[PDB]
Amino acid sequence: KPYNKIVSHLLVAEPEKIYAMPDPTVPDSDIKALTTLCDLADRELVVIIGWAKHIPGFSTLSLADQMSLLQSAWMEILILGVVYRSLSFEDELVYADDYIMDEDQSKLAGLLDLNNAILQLVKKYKSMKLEKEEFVTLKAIALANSDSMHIEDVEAVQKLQDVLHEALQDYEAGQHMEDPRRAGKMLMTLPLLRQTSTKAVQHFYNIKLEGKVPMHKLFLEMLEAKV
Amino acid sequence: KPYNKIVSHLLVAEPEKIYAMPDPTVPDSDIKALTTLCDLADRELVVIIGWAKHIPGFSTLSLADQMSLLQSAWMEILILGVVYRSLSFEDELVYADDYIMDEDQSKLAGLLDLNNAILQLVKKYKSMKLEKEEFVTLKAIALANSDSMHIEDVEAVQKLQDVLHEALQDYEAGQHMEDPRRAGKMLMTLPLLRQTSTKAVQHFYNIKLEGKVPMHKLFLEMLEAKV
Ligand SMILES: CC(C)(c1ccccc1)c1ccc(O)cc1
Numbered sequence: 001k002p003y004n005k006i007v008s009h010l011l012v013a014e015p016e017k018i019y020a021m022p023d024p025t026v027p028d029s030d031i032k033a034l035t036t037l038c039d040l041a042d043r044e045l046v047v048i049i050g051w052a053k054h055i056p057g058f059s060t061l062s063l064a065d066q067m068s069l070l071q072s073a074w075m076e077i078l079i080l081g082v083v084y085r086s087l088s089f090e091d092e093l094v095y096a097d098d099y100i101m102d103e104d105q106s107k108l109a110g111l112l113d114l115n116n117a118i119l120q121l122v123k124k125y126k127s128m129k130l131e132k133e134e135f136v137t138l139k140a141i142a143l144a145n146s147d148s149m150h151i152e153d154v155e156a157v158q159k160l161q162d163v164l165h166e167a168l169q170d171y172e173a174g175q176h177m178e179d180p181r182r183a184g185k186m187l188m189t190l191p192l193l194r195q196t197s198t199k200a201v202q203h204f205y206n207i208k209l210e211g212k213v214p215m216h217k218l219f220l221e222m223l224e225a226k227v
Numbered sequence: 228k229p230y231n232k233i234v235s236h237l238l239v240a241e242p243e244k245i246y247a248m249p250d251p252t253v254p255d256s257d258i259k260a261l262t263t264l265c266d267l268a269d270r271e272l273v274v275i276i277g278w279a280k281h282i283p284g285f286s287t288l289s290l291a292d293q294m295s296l297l298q299s300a301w302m303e304i305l306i307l308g309v310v311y312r313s314l315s316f317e318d319e320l321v322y323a324d325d326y327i328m329d330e331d332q333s334k335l336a337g338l339l340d341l342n343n344a345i346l347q348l349v350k351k352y353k354s355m356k357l358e359k360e361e362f363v364t365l366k367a368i369a370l371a372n373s374d375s376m377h378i379e380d381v382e383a384v385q386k387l388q389d390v391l392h393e394a395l396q397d398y399e400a401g402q403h404m405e406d407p408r409r410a411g412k413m414l415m416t417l418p419l420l421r422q423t424s425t426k427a428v429q430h431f432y433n434i435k436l437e438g439k440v441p442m443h444k445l446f447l448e449m450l451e452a453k454v
Pocket residue numbers: 037038040041044078079081082095111114115200204
């Protein structure tokens with residue numbers, strides 16, 4: 001009862017920060033902004049795949065089921081990261097330490113509506129005082145609960161959901177006795193995460209189809225996955 | 228402890244069944260199918276607005292906040308209804324007793340992908356053995372948790388969420404002692420409901436823009452709401 005092992009484990013499994021490194025030789029444009037974001041996402045995806053192996057039971061799934069979960073959840077994981085990094089900021093999104101977007105920049109990149117939705121997620125989590133413990137557990141839950149149409153072992157995936165849900169419940173029962181409904185409140189933030197992710201995916205799929213922004217192999221693979 | 232009053236209340240507040248009444252004089256087409264569905268939805272929307280007043284604290288919200296919740300949640304409520312009606316069927320959606328769509332009909336109407344997503348929701352709820360008690364409580368939660376950008380009294384809306392979340396938790400603690408994580412499992416079905424609803428809204432917005440399917444006042448009002 002010092003607190004949940006799965007939560008502790010997810011905390012130590014947390015990947016190091018990644019830099020966006022916008023090209024200082026390129027003039028600022030919508031194409032620059034979007035090229036930078038997609039490049040950053042491609043590198044994050046590598047780290048996410050590595051991170052997932054630390055989740056209890058994930059590496060025991062078939063490679064196919066592992067990839068199905070990742071192909072469904074990837075954008076929710078990416079978004080939750082930016083959301084968390086942005087918690088101590090106001091009306092700004094911390095994509096990286098060297099890449100913090102305010103309203104004007106979002107307009108320039110054509111991302112005003114998308115970044116406003118992400119800011120809505122930030123707003124909700126701020127008022128809830130989302131902790132790192134909660135963030136890492138929610139990223140794991142979003143992976144397990146990602147609703148892929150293509151799952152082979154449905155029951156094993158449901159088991160993984162249950163293991164991580166239990167970790168959230170246990171953590172909340174021990175750490176937040178003042179609110180016995182905090183775990184459920186955390187789970188009730190997942191629909192807006194799903195909604196914002198669905199919008200981000202279609203948006204960047206549209207950018208992919210327009211052909212003006214170069215994208216790397218892994219990002220494209222994730223983007224080109226079937227719903 | 229016979230069981231939760233809010234749940235009992237929602238049960239008696241449950242609206243009577245509505246008929247689709249496809250026009251028997253009109254030849255079957257995609258336009259007929261979609262005209263019928265949108266007409267049915269328009270009449271359901273009237274009943275949903277009436278139903279919401281029975282939810283504790285809802286009518287105490289300002290008219291603006293009431294309408295914001297409804298304009299964000301309406302499609303999730305409509306979808307959850309079809310999902311529930313379809314639970315004892317296989318690969319068919321019971322839009323109404325006189326309007327049950329199989330795969331072929333969905334293809335004809337251009338709804339294959341949408342109806343497959345709704346069937347995924349059905350599949351999950353079947354395996355969970357979703358009860359009417361749970362269905363009615365989830366419709367209410369989806370309304371309160373609908374994530375409108377336009378809320379005036381955020382704290383009152385959060386209170387409504389909490390009241391209905393508490394009802395779900397209490398019901399599950401009393402009725403399903405074999406699974407102390409069933410309430411959370413119910414909440415973890417809301418992201419796919421949100422996802423499917425977002426897709427249904429854009430789809431029918433596209434149909435609205437094409438101008439070939441006539442739609443009524445209230446349905447259009449709900450469709451024309453800002454995200
Ligand atoms: C490019 C992408 C997918 C993005 C950018 C803007 C809005 C939504 C997603 C992104 C990139 C990096 C990241 O950490 C999170 C998301």
